[PDB]
Amino acid sequence: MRPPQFTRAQWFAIQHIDSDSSPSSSSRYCTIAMRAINNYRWRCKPVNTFVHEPLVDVQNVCFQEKVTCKNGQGNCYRSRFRMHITDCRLTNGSKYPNCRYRTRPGRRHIIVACEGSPYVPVHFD
Numbered sequence: 615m616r617p618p619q620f621t622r623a624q625w626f627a628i629q630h631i632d633s634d635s636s637p638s639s640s641s642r643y644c645t646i647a648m649r650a651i652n653n654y655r656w657r658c659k660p661v662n663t664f665v666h667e668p669l670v671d672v673q674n675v676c677f678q679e680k681v682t683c684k685n686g687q688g689n690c691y692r693s694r695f696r697m698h699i700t701d702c703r704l705t706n707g708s709k710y711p712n713c714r715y716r717t718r719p720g721r722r723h724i725i726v727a728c729e730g731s732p733y734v735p736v737h738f739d
Contacts, residue, residue, distance in 0.1 A: 617654045622729065622736035629662060630738050633669040637698035637719060644702035644715035658704050658713035663738060665724065666698040672735060676728035683739060688727045690739050696721045 616625045629651050644662075652658050665672055675693045683690040699722060702715040726735040 615655065623732075623734045626726075626735050626737065627669070630665055630735075631669055631672055632664045632666050632700075633672075635666045637666050637700075637721070639700055639717055639719060641717050643700060644717040645713070647700075648702055648713060648715055652710060652713050655710075658708050658710050660704045662702045663724075664700045664702070666700070672697075672724075672726075673732075675724065675726050676733050676735060681725060683727055684725075688729065688737070690725055690727045692725045693723045695723070697724050699724065 616622065620628065632647070647664060648659065648662060651662065675691050677691070678694040679692040681690050681692045699720050701718040701720060703718070705714045705716060708714055725739040727737040727739055728734060729736045
């Protein structure tokens with residue numbers, strides 16, 4: 615659930631943009647990074663992906679390959695290049711505030727929904 619104090623665009627950046635950061639991370643990266651998200655949530659988010667490119671690279675995906683959204687609703691775009699991502703997966707038995715995560719680096723195209731003025735990512739697809 616998006617905290618009401620954040621726009622869709624702000625919440626996307628909080629959850630998914632680690633702007634201009636190292637693609638390689640420690641194995642504790644996700645456990646530490648997810649606290650900022652889960653502090654606003656009722657229960658630990660089960661999976662989450664962070665992108666490491668500079669912010670403007672992620673915003674540029676809104677001007678790259680148009681594709682259909684998974685839900686069929688909205689304007690979705692696939693990145694021209696593979697992004698540097700980190701996938702976070704909640705460990706079994708975790709219960710807030712004891713949320714620990716597996717950390718997995720990766721390099722793949724991302725798909726985002728874009729909306730608004732400015733026209734920026736609002737949903738990781």
